[PDB]
């Protein structure tokens, strides 16, 4: 069903914001129905983006 | 290229990776994970040498004089 066909990075914000919560929390693998490999790569990505202020830790 | 499985080539590859590892072990002294590996590989090389000493005396002495390997502990 849902899948990643495009290279996932910290700069594809559309992608990463799918897998982020309203509060900017990272959603679990069981929810996102991703292979473990994927999920890890997402996670690190999100953190990197978070540091570069592409996505917020907390909200306004 | 030559024999990549030959005793003498292997012992070389080992002696070389060890003297290489030596610099890293000198710069970062706190890395025990790496040292443990060093001790393992040195063990391997020492084994092969003992083997080779059993099998061929000549090839052995030639080798440890060639690669500057310290003389054996059976003396």
């Amino acid at each position: 069903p849902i899948q990643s066909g495009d290279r996932i990075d910290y700069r594809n914000m559309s992608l990463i914001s799918r897998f982020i919560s309203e509060q900017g929390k990272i959603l679990s693998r069981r929810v996102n129905r991703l292979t473990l490999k994927q999920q890890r790569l997402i996670t690190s990505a999100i953190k990197q983006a978070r540091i570069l202020s592409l996505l917020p830790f907390l909200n306004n | 290229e030559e024999n990549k499985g030959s005793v003498e080539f292997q012992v070389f590859c080992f002696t070389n990776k060890i003297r290489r590892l030596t610099l890293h072990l000198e710069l970062h002294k706190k890395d025990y994970s790496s040292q443990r590996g060093l001790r393992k590989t040195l063990g391997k090389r020492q084994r092969l040498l003992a083997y080779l000493l059993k099998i061929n005396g000549v090839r052995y002495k030639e080798l440890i004089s060639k690669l500057n390997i310290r003389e054996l502990k059976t003396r």
Partner: protein, 65 residues
């Protein structure tokens, strides 16, 4: 500034729907359980207890229903 929960009240406002919307926002982020959790200190053991308990609770609630 910062915020955890955002409840914006429109002008259709009545007290109970507002109160419960907010209540489910707090249930949704799990903030009160959170501050009952960080009230005191837990050794790694009560963390593994809490993880197994809560995770397998909501997980077996997902696999039964």
């Amino acid at each position: 500034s910062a915020y955890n929960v955002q409840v914006l009240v429109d002008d259709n406002e009545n007290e109970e729907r507002l109160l419960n919307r907010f209540r489910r926002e707090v249930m949704r982020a799990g903030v009160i359980q959170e501050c009952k959790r960080r009230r005191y200190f837990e050794n790694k053991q009560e963390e593994k207890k809490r993880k197994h308990r809560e995770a397998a609770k909501r997980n077996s609630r997902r696999r039964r229903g």
